[PDB]
Structure formats: C-alpha cells, structure tokens
Symmetry: C2
Subunit: 76 residues, 2 copies
C-alpha cells in the first residue's frame, strides 16, 4: 500500500541518537527504520497508520533543527 | 516531489549484501540503491529508477534469488 511516511535527513550520528530517542520517548508512529543512506549524511524513515497519526506526530514530537523533515509516501 | 518508481528487495541481510554488491555491477539498469536497512536479520534494499521503462529492464536482466522477496512500488521524493 502507498504508506504515509516522513524521512528525517541529517548527520548519521544525530540520526542514530534521534532514532533511540524516538523509540524510547515518543508515540504517534507505526515503525521507524534503521539509519540508512543512498559519507556522514543519512536518512531515517518513520511510518504511520494514517494521515491523522502522522499529523499528531508532527504536532508533538520534538525533532532537531539540524534534521530535515520530509513528508511523503512510499509503497510497503 | 514526484512519485518515483522503485522496488524493495527484502531478505536475509547476507543475501542482500551480496546481491547489492553484485548489482553495483549493472548500475546501468537503476538510478540509485540504498544501503541495507530494517524496521526497528530481515533487511531491505531500496532501488530507484528514473522511469518504469528502466525498471522493467532491470527486472528483465537481473537475477534475484527466491528467498529475496521483490516488492514493486513507488515512493515520493
């Protein structure tokens, strides 16, 4: 299905720590990936069960300025 | 953002790492290819293409083992 996601892009280390933090302290997401890349820059994919969950996530989960938030969709 | 054609390959991480190294040799047939990742072993490789033409080519010349699940789809970017 074409799933709503967001990709968090930035420093690989900043992202690894953000992933731990998301996992330990935050709600409003279905799954989150390991840090990956297509090198000091990376990507973290977060999936949602709906557009409303993704919106709740973006209205309440603190994400660092240095990490870019790209909203989007992908087949999974 | 545009809907980009892709395929995900899912399977054993070793399998995927080997296949990914092979593929890196046939880079003509795809746009990009990710490092191996997983949902937080069952790894995943994402391959991107600049057209459905190029994807269909890829799928017609590349050999994928049966234990590696091919998932065709798209993603925005």
């Amino acid at each position: 299905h074409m799933t709503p996601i967001i990709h968090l892009k930035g420093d690989r280390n900043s992202l690894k720590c953000l992933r731990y933090r998301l996992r330990k302290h935050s709600d409003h997401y279905r799954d989150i990936s390991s840090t990956w890349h297509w090198e000091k820059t990376g990507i973290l994919t977060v999936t949602y069960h709906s557009e409303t969950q993704r919106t709740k996530f973006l209205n309440t989960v603190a994400i660092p300025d240095s990490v870019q938030i790209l909203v989007g969709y992908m087949t999974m």
